[PDB]
């Protein structure tokens, strides 16, 4: 049993301060820098993203340099709480905690408990 909630928010704070960025948050614990908006993908629409999932240190663990399409419920919770914000064309990051990401168990390529920074580019919605 693990409770990586406060620690992850602390890495969010000191990373988003080292980086001069300033992201807002939610009641669940996300952090994101909305950068644009195409002009809302809800929990029954498809998507088309060009993200890059890299840790807080800088190392990356997954890319989508060519467009992909998910159902937006299959995604992890952080997407579903940040990605419905922007429309088709915009862009956003996500400073996902470990509970809104791959949990405190973690899969391969992601240690159990670690901030997961994404840089999403929602091409289109279906």
């Amino acid at each position: 049993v693990k409770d990586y909630t406060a620690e992850n928010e602390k890495e969010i704070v000191d990373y988003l301060a080292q980086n001069n960025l300033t992201a807002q948050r939610t009641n669940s614990g996300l952090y994101y820098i909305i950068t644009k908006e195409g002009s809302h993908p809800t929990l029954n629409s498809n998507i088309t993203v060009i993200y890059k999932g890299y840790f807080t240190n800088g190392k990356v663990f997954d890319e989508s340099t060519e467009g992909v399409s998910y159902s937006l419920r299959t995604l992890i919770p952080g997407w579903k709480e940040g990605i419905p914000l922007l429309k088709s064309g915009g862009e956003i990051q996500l400073f996902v905690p470990a509970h809104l990401g791959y949990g405190s168990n973690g899969n391969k390529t992601v240690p159990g408990g670690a901030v997961l920074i994404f840089e999403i580019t929602l091409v289109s919605v279906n």
Binding site: D62, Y70, T74, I76, N107
Partner: peptide, 18 residues
Amino acid sequence: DYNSSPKVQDVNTNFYNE
């Protein structure tokens, strides 16, 4: 499917299993 992608939560509702 349980590789590294931002994709858990399988076809019906379950998490992908290793």
